[PDB]
């Protein structure tokens, strides 16, 4: 979204996204600030975030999330959005995906990957042998 959004003043570096990002997934982070702070790029270096709107591209989701973590910790910036761009050009909203931080309980979220009882009740591997079932599956 808003691919024409201004980018932080960075001088290059050799740790940015490679050709693989061109033909595959490429993450982007767009955040807004009020002061031209200096932040350590996740790829190695120092950049100045333009006062107003900042948009940068990365090759991994973890890199964008780490940058967001430092923007939220080193600075009191919580309006950071992480999107994913595919070679076709369709953008995908990844972080926070709902406008609320993941560790902040919010309504409308459906529990995924839940197992009844504690792990001590998991079946033995011998009981699910030669079948498409796992121990954690009840």
């Amino acid at each position: 979204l808003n691919l024409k959004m201004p980018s932080p003043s960075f001088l290059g570096s050799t740790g940015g996204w490679l050709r693989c990002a061109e033909t595959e997934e490429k993450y982007a982070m767009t955040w807004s600030s009020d002061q031209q702070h200096i932040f350590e790029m996740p790829t190695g270096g120092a950049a100045v975030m333009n006062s107003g709107d900042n948009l940068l591209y990365l090759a991994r989701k973890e890199q964008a999330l780490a940058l967001a973590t430092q923007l939220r910790t080193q600075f009191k910036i919580q309006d950071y959005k992480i999107y994913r761009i595919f070679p076709s050009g369709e953008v995908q909203y990844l972080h926070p995906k709902d406008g609320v931080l993941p560790y902040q309980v919010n309504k409308g979220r459906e529990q995924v990957g839940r197992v009844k009882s504690t792990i001590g009740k998991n079946v033995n591997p011998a009981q699910v042998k030669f079948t498409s079932k796992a121990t954690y599956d009840r």
């Binding site: 989701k61 999330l65 993941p102 459906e110 839940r114």
Partner: protein, 80 residues
């Protein structure tokens, strides 16, 4: 394609979500603890298996278990 599974012993402390570096976990309403929240893993496709959540879990035996299964580009943490 690692499988992250949350068990009923979860106390809803959110430490797993706070310690996850890939936004794979989140907090959802629940009624199994006073916190009224439970950990969920709806974005396990982005998990890499670092097990930071397992380390950040306070329950006696980890209420969140990450099983290393299918390996993909996201799980291998390849920037190239």
């Amino acid at each position: 394609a690692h499988t992250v599974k949350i068990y009923d012993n979860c106390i809803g402390c959110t430490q797993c979500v706070r310690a996850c570096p890939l936004d794979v976990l989140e907090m959802v309403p629940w009624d199994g603890c006073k916190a009224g929240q439970m950990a969920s893993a709806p974005r396990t496709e982005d998990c890499v298996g670092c097990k930071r959540c397992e380390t950040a879990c306070p329950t006696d035996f980890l209420s969140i278990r990450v099983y290393l299964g299918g390996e993909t580009t996201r799980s291998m943490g390849l920037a190239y």
